[PDB]
Design a protein around this ligand. Structure first.
Ligand SMILES: [Ca+2]
Length: 445
């Protein structure tokens, strides 16, 4: 029985991915990417082990809304990205390939100068125009105009009804499988609770992925009490910047995050892990700034995501070491004829997560970490895997005891084909610099 903790998500900003059906030299303009472009790359995505895609919003936007987040019409596809038919086609085609489609949904606000502002029957549809002054004050966070965006009043039953109805409508119309929920910390928990109860009732197993941009796992985790299934893991991202983004950096922060997640969240396996997104600098730029090779960095970093708990979420272009700084330079036009070195690697590790249940459902034990060389063990049912990640500049040796693994078994490697024979003293792993290995325990009984 496939569940959401089994998935891996390829995350696409639509206008910036693939134009098959507008000024490319304007960093804040439309580049032309559309839904037909997404559909044409489903096999491409599936091959790297992704079982699901998340699209940025595709509703009709206010002028300039290339990214989709400035909604105008909640009941219409933006003509820049194509038609309702195109979208239905995308979902059908993904479904043929056993892939899920999550759409990006905004309940918090509409685009700048939205017409409802000047509609007398919808004056009560908005909070008084106010800046968010104290980003630790929940009332301001919830009533303020986020980056000046007209902020909707979900306490008004008309707004609450309009939004929920619209959300349900797209599920019925196109058979999507989830929503990534925008600006969740800006909308009251009592609304999300009802939204979740109602939207998710349209379709069995319909998944909500919340964006609560906080570095405090307890803050995010409380929203899990209000019907949102999973969350983008911003606390992990903080760890990623200090660990995976720099060679010879301890990987302990990453595990500490998990240890905290498992305790704070009811569903810690539905936390979306990411090396970057459309709101951060590119991981490639983090690596370059650290005077590291992006190629080996990304291969190493994505191996952690694909071997750790949660739901891996990879931003389009990561697989070609896409460079980029602050929004909008992190949204460059995708390249489908770049070097395939990371793609070929991902074609090993991505699918490997799908093929070994312990990587999707196992526990997550730290057997060893010292200065960037980490060894982890995951167990699920009869299966035991051991993941070793060498984040250092040299070959590393790690000895595991017969108290950390059953005695006298064998460990087969699934990245570099390798075998490790246990003895009376335990097991010895040796990894070259900046390499990882996934071992599955082999039984001799
Ligand atoms: Ca709000």
């Amino acid at each position: 029985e496939r569940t959401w903790q089994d998935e891996a998500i390829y995350f696409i900003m639509v206008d910036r991915f693939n134009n098959m059906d507008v000024n490319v030299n304007d960093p804040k303009g439309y580049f032309g990417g559309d839904l037909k472009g997404v559909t044409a790359k489903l096999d491409y995505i599936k091959e790297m082990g992704f079982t699901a895609i998340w699209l940025t919003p595709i509703f009709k936007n206010m002028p300039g809304g290339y990214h989709g987040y400035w909604i105008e019409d909640f009941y219409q596809v933006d003509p820049h990205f194509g038609t309702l038919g195109d979208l239905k086609t995308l979902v059908k085609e993904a479904h043929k390939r056993d892939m899920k489609v999550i759409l990006d949904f905004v309940a918090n606000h509409v685009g700048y100068n939205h017409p409802w502002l000047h509609d007398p029957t919808k004056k009560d549809w908005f909070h008084p125009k106010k800046e968010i002054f104290d980003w630790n004050d929940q009332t301001q966070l919830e009533n303020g105009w986020v980056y000046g965006l007209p902020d909707l009043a979900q306490e008004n039953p008309e707004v609450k009804t309009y939004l929920i109805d619209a959300a349900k409508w797209w599920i019925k119309e196109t058979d999507i499988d989830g929503y990534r929920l925008d600006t969740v910390r800006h909308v009251p928990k009592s609304f999300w609770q009802e939204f979740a109860k109602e939207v998710k009732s349209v379709k069995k197993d319909f998944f909500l992925l919340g964006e609560v941009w906080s570095d405090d796992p307890r803050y995010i985790a409380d929203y899990g009490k209000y019907g949102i299934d999973g969350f983008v893991d911003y606390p992990l991202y903080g760890a990623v910047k200090q660990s995976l983004a720099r060679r010879d950096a301890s990987l302990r922060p990453l595990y500490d995050v998990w240890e905290y997640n498992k305790t704070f969240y009811d569903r810690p396996y539905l936390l979306g892990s990411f090396l970057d997104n459309h709101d951060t600098v590119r991981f490639t730029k983090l690596a370059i700034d650290n005077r590291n090779n992006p190629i080996s960095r990304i291969k190493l970093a994505m191996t952690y995501l694909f071997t750790a708990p949660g739901i891996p979420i990879m931003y389009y272009g990561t697989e070609i070491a896409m460079n980029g700084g602050q929004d909008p330079d992190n949204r460059r036009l995708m390249d489908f004829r770049a070097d395939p070195e990371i793609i070929d690697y991902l074609k090993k590790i991505g699918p490997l997560r799908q093929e070994l249940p312990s990587l999707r459902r196992g526990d997550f034990t730290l057997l060893y970490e010292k200065d960037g060389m980490a060894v982890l063990k995951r167990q699920y049912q009869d299966e035991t895997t051991v993941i070793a990640i060498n984040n250092t500049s040299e070959t590393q040796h790690v000895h595991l005891t017969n108290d950390q693994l059953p005695k006298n078994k064998e460990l087969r490697g699934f990245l570099l084909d390798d075998l490790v024979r246990g003895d009376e003293d335990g097991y010895d792993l040796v990894l070259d610099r900046e390499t990882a290995e996934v071992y599955k325990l082999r039984e001799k009984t």
